[PDB]
Amino acid sequence: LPYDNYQELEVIDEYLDYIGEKYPDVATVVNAAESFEGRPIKYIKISTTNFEDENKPVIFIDGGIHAREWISPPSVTWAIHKLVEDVTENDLLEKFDWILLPVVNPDGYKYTFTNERFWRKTRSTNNNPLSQICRGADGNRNFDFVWNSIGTSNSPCSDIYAGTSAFSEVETRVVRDILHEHLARMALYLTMHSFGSMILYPWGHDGSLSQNALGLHTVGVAMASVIQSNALPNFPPYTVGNSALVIGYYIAGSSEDYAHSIGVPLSYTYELPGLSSGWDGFHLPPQYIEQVCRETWEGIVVGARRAGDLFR
């Protein structure tokens, strides 16, 4: 178990393989692709009907796009634990099929363990020689959404580098392929990040509302509310709202915006808690990991329920 520590990439990976092997009648692990460096990228597919009954919408949750945000992956694997290992909300398996990608960017995650704790990009290089020095691209700037128009830098060494082109990163292409393959029945998309205790929705490039703003801000407020009553007295309150207006700046190329631009009705970027305003924020004290994973699961429960209502 040990949700008492931030686990290594191999541990997270081995966990999906454990769920896949132990509960094959409800879970299926798929090795999407290979990261830039050769590491397998994996997600797990949970369904009590083998993804066959298309009348059941899909819930897609992912984390680990940003290497340094360590609290992100365990929140995703805790959802996997709650969906397969300790099912206390049976209606969630009845009503939906699920896809969870704990770590979208494995080369960057591992690298925060082996080399630099606060690296955020991927670890790719390209025909351009300067990429030998400046590796990777900001994954949450890589999606084809007004790509590179704002919130980025053309320097391959910037941490907000958008990549050589939209979806130039295989890690980002994996998320894309999931969105499209399940677009028809995807009721909700949650991409987990850190930190700020925030639940953000499109649009991130200009801070304007989308046609589905009412539902977005209603289900968020409802998720943020259940978190709050399950949270620890010392944690800050959740802020719900438009991504750009809450986060304070404009960003082009996010996965949340991209997912919304192609039709996913409810798509949010969850900025999990941090207790220090600086780099320390990306390292919520370990003793809190199981708590943040637990409360965040209560948010996911309310949000998947509300999203199911609004999808029908």
- Catalytically active residues are 271
Over the window 288 to 307, marking each residue x when it contacts Zn ion by CB under 5 A and - when it does not, the resulting string is: --------------------
Least gap, CB of 256 to Zn ion (angstroms): 11
Least gap, CB of 254 to Zn ion (angstroms): 9
193 binds Zn ion (CB under 5 A): yes
* Token representation of residue 160: 């907000």
Nearer to Zn ion, 66 or 81 (CB): 66
Least gap, CB of 87 to Zn ion (angstroms): 29
Nearby residues of 1 by Cβ (< 8 Å), 6 or more positions away: none
> 179-217 burial by CB neighbour count: b if 16+ within 10 A, else e?
beebeeebbbbbbbbbbbbbbbbbbbbebeebebeebbb
Closest residue to Zn ion in the complex (CB): 193
* Token representation of residue 6: 């931030």
SS3 200: strand
Listed ranges 18-26, 122-130, 146-154, 185-193: which one lies at the site for Zn ion (CB under 5 A)? 185-193
Please answer whether residues 226 and 302 qualify as being in contact, where contact means their C-beta atoms are separated by less than 8 angstroms.
yes
Over the window 58 to 97, marking each residue x when it contacts Zn ion by CB under 5 A and - when it does not, the resulting string is: --------x-------------------------------
Query: Residue 297: is the preceding peptide bond cis (ω within 30°)?
Result: no
Nearer to Zn ion, 66 or 260 (CB): 66
Nearer to Zn ion, 18 or 118 (CB): 118
Query: Residue 195: is the preceding peptide bond cis (ω within 30°)?
Result: yes
Strand order in the sheet with 239-242: 27-34, 40-46, 97-101, 58-63, 186-194, 267-272, 198-201, 239-242
Least gap, CB of 65 to Zn ion (angstroms): 6
Nearer to Zn ion, 260 or 305 (CB): 260
Residues that bind Zn ion (CB under 5 A): 66, 193
